[PDB]
Design an enzyme around this catalytic site. Sequence first.
Site, mmCIF file in Angstrom:
data_model
loop_
_atom_site.group_PDB
_atom_site.id
_atom_site.type_symbol
_atom_site.label_atom_id
_atom_site.label_comp_id
_atom_site.label_asym_id
_atom_site.label_seq_id
_atom_site.Cartn_x
_atom_site.Cartn_y
_atom_site.Cartn_z
ATOM 1 N N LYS A 63 14.159 38.715 25.829
ATOM 2 C CA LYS A 63 14.641 40.038 26.174
ATOM 3 C C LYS A 63 14.187 40.389 27.580
ATOM 4 O O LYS A 63 12.992 40.384 27.881
ATOM 5 C CB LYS A 63 14.137 41.092 25.189
ATOM 6 C CG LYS A 63 14.596 40.846 23.775
ATOM 7 C CD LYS A 63 13.922 41.744 22.763
ATOM 8 C CE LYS A 63 14.106 43.211 23.066
ATOM 9 N NZ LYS A 63 13.402 44.046 22.060
ATOM 10 N N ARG A 119 2.688 53.072 23.241
ATOM 11 C CA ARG A 119 3.133 54.085 22.296
ATOM 12 C C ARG A 119 2.134 55.229 22.248
ATOM 13 O O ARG A 119 0.920 55.018 22.356
ATOM 14 C CB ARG A 119 3.209 53.501 20.884
ATOM 15 C CG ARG A 119 4.248 52.445 20.674
ATOM 16 C CD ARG A 119 5.496 53.067 20.138
ATOM 17 N NE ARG A 119 6.586 52.109 20.047
ATOM 18 C CZ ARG A 119 7.842 52.439 19.795
ATOM 19 N NH1 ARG A 119 8.179 53.707 19.605
ATOM 20 N NH2 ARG A 119 8.766 51.497 19.747
ATOM 21 N N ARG A 164 19.100 42.128 12.626
ATOM 22 C CA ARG A 164 17.935 42.242 13.494
ATOM 23 C C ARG A 164 16.850 43.066 12.818
ATOM 24 O O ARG A 164 17.091 44.197 12.366
ATOM 25 C CB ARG A 164 18.323 42.896 14.821
ATOM 26 C CG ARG A 164 17.149 43.250 15.712
ATOM 27 C CD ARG A 164 17.651 43.903 17.003
ATOM 28 N NE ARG A 164 16.575 44.353 17.884
ATOM 29 C CZ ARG A 164 16.172 45.617 18.053
ATOM 30 N NH1 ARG A 164 16.742 46.624 17.400
ATOM 31 N NH2 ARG A 164 15.172 45.878 18.893
ATOM 32 N N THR A 179 21.878 47.852 23.269
ATOM 33 C CA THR A 179 21.193 49.141 23.299
ATOM 34 C C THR A 179 22.061 50.283 23.798
ATOM 35 O O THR A 179 22.565 50.265 24.928
ATOM 36 C CB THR A 179 19.854 49.059 24.014
ATOM 37 O OG1 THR A 179 19.133 47.976 23.426
ATOM 38 C CG2 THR A 179 19.072 50.344 23.830
HETATM 39 O O1 LIG Z 1 14.165 46.436 23.165
HETATM 40 C C1 LIG Z 1 15.371 46.722 23.288
HETATM 41 O O2 LIG Z 1 16.280 46.286 22.518
HETATM 42 C C2 LIG Z 1 15.714 47.623 24.449
HETATM 43 O O3 LIG Z 1 14.749 48.144 25.084
HETATM 44 O O4 LIG Z 1 16.913 47.804 24.787
HETATM 45 K K LIG Z 2 11.008 45.546 19.318
HETATM 46 MG MG LIG Z 3 12.862 47.355 24.501
#
Ligand SMILES: O=C([O-])C(=O)[O-]
Ligand SMILES: [K+]
Ligand SMILES: [Mg+2]
Lengths: 522, 519
Positions: A264, A114, A67, A322
């Site tokens: 995601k 950010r 990744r 994560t």
């Molecule tokens: O972006 C990611 O992988 C997260 O926030 O878990």
């Molecule tokens: K990212």
């Molecule tokens: Mg994230």
Amino acid sequence: EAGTAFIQTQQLHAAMADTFLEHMCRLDIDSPPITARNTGIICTIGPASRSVETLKEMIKSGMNVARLNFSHGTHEYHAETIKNVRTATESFASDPILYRPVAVALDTKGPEIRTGLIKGSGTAEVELKKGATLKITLDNAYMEKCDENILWLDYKNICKVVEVGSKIYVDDGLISLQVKQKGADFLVTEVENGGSLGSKKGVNLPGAAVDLPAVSEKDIQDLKFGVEQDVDMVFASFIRKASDVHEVRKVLGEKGKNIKIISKIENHEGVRRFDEILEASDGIMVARGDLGIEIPAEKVFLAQKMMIGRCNRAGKPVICATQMLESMIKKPRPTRAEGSDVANAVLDGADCIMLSGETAKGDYPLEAVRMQHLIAREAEAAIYHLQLFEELRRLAPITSDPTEATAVGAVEASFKCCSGAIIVLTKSGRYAHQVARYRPRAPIIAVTRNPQTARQAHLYRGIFPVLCKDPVQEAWAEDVDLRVNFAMNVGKARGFFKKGDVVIVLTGWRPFTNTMRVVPVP
Amino acid sequence: IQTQQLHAAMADTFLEHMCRLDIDSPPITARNTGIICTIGPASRSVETLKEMIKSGMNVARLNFSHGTHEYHAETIKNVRTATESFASDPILYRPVAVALDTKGPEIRTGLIKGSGTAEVELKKGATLKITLDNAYMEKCDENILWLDYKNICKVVEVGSKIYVDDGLISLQVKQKGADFLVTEVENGGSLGSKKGVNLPGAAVDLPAVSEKDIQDLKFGVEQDVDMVFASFIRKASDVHEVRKVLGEKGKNIKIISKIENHEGVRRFDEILEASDGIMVARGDLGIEIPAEKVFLAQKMMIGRCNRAGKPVICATQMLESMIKKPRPTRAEGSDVANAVLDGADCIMLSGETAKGDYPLEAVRMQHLIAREAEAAIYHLQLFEELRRLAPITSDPTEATAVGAVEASFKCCSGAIIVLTKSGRYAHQVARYRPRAPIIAVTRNPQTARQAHLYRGIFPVLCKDPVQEAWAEDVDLRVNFAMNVGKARGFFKKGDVVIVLTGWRPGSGFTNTMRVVPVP
Ligand SMILES: O=C([O-])C(=O)[O-]
Ligand SMILES: [K+]
Ligand SMILES: [Mg+2]
Ligand SMILES: O=C([O-])C(=O)[O-]
Ligand SMILES: [Cl-]
Ligand SMILES: [Cl-]
Ligand SMILES: [K+]
Ligand SMILES: [Mg+2]
């Protein structure tokens, strides 16, 4: 000569229990798992892991997908990482029986917020104290002059979407601020949870309607670069609705049409609109970092199990991501919660598990990969397949599609004879995906000549992709036999099965299709 | 949409149950899973303990691996002062139990030599001598490490591995002496004082109950503790030894055996039979056995305790990062939820409450996660399996308990109210795992504290005198539970509650079930 004391391997005593409760009661730490590990391991590559020599060890330790996190690093940095991944991967190419394909995934920056640089060099930190006041500014004069009194961030419309009383989270949700006053281009906040603040940290606005695009102009530039670099899949950050998925897919062009699009899910709207996102996507990542800041931390497990369940129901890959082994950024062994989290992701049904800081930046990247491998194998044996397979079948529609009937028949046969593997000859991956959705215990050895298929197929639980390099034989039957023999050699060399064991073979496209044979290993 | 994950509750398969879990379906007020908090410097003051109780602490754990009796007596005093500060209202007072966690057959290092760095660096490949010579007990460093297991040399040989400090440092024995071992550092790291040591390959021969443990257990009896968490229980005879020390005076103290090593897992059934309950003591367990196997042992023990109807505690590192941070990691939130989904009666905090910077946040987070996970349980399958696997009996009380649990599902009741002196009648309901909270009314203060160990039991301590007429005294106690439930928001007028009471004066059957509209 030991006799009755024999303990069945791969939790087979628990596998035969007639209730789930008794299944649990029979789980046995002294019952060793099989060699094959079905759950793909995705590793974020960064300073700790991007050297060719480390990547070689990552591959040996079990990494299936590299990744690339485009939240950090410039294009030349990612180009060199990709180059190093490929050098490491191809260092094993001289023996196709043992070569492990390794996929490359581009994870977009997307609509992040950010902060700026702490004043000085940017590598310092400032202490934010509870009850202190902190001004958030959009004035770029301060973009490299952040400190405990003034914090710059990059979201130009922040003042529109927050209100007095709302909460602002900084740095993995660890610092929390409450908005006390608004200005045309500033917010006056009070520190609730204080802490040490560094540079360029992520900001979350839970409950605020953030209007940044899922795919910005700069994200498009990254995606176009991903196509140029021949990536296998995109992990698209902050997907909120089906049209966001289309923004990712369509901009890749014809050239990128075979790249897999993994959405995601990391905010409340993505959870609420999950069904339409799933329909539009090739697969899903449960991106728990942002998700557990955007929604209450105590609700993440609900969203995780919901999404894994629905992906299993749809037959589309789902990644659990994560902080799975987070303490291993600094320590050589994980915490007890981390061991449990990895195991439960597998038991929930996740196709893949992921490492982020543990491999990108930590002190023990190889140990983290190895621990995910060990836990996943143990958990795969502990799955209660008797119930899972029954439910997947009952929830699976009757169709006239002969290939779906072949796949379920093959998985049924695999359970009936406790087969050592299901060997599948596949060009695009499809036939192997169809088997994987019924979640056999036995590994699925997917033989392909398509290198991209070999890389992408890691996304499905159980698929062990192998890349045949032999020329196509003119006689179809001879070409099938060549590919089947290749799979037999793989399984023997890798310890999945031995001569005389029973395996299932699905011979793929025939110029009926995908005939099934149940045969002893020659 | 529907609250309490009731849409997921109605699914016909476990897979669809998962698919229906809804972050927008809010849980009920009541939290069924007991929270056990280790008390230490971060949490020992009366002021902090009051907030711990408000945040959800049900049991205070005292770790006798450290401290003096004087110190622990003061901790207990403070726990009681904090608990009784809420007693002015019997309806909003929460009983708080006291648990004594024994040292047991623990191995620990000595104190780092205090004239240099507080911790020493053990580097891979370096030599380190292990000594038993007490001259070095307070002079440990990178050259010589004292530990307190005087017979260690008899149970290890050349090649044996020794783990130190949560299993993070490891050494290999290279040579043996009379009272020392020459080792090589395998996995290095920073070593502080008084760290735990594990010998996973050795048959450690320390007593199950040492002279120190006897003193501590007798102190626990004298201090009127509610339960003992007995460390490193390996076999039924170890449980017998603990029970013998507690003796007649301590006969009602609950013995929770901590399963922390491979032998305890192997001998689990006989340990469970003799024990009142079990702790999955994952810290030591995940050093003694491979870390990747702990979840198997956890789920095995929770399952078997659920079958037996005895409490099981999931313990150790559940929210570990909250020692230093105000929010947990994603794995930690998952671990707490999955312990509840597995079937754990209680969940526990160690360093998070004893030593960390965010004790209250850690308690509050266990409360929040447990409540969400309790709603997400697939009761349809769990209740069916518990019924099918239960021992066969014609006992009227058991039949009434099962009937009450089924009735509670049928009307989505606000509570099952049960009257109990010693706890058993409420335990019998809890073992069938209703969704509805079990309000257990007792006049016995120890029962009120101990009952926290069972999932779903919300103990309430009635302080009213006994009424002259048995039926009027039953009614008084039921009405007390009704008012507590109403005041605490568990139910209101128009809801339905299940009420379980005794047969008649002089009977021990709890065989009467009423289904009561809440007035
Ligand atoms: O972006 C990611 O992988 C997260 O926030 O878990
Ligand atoms: K990212
Ligand atoms: Mg994230
Ligand atoms: O003793 C404990 O609690 C442990 O080792 O987890
Ligand atoms: Cl896979
Ligand atoms: Cl409880
Ligand atoms: K202890
Ligand atoms: Mg222990």
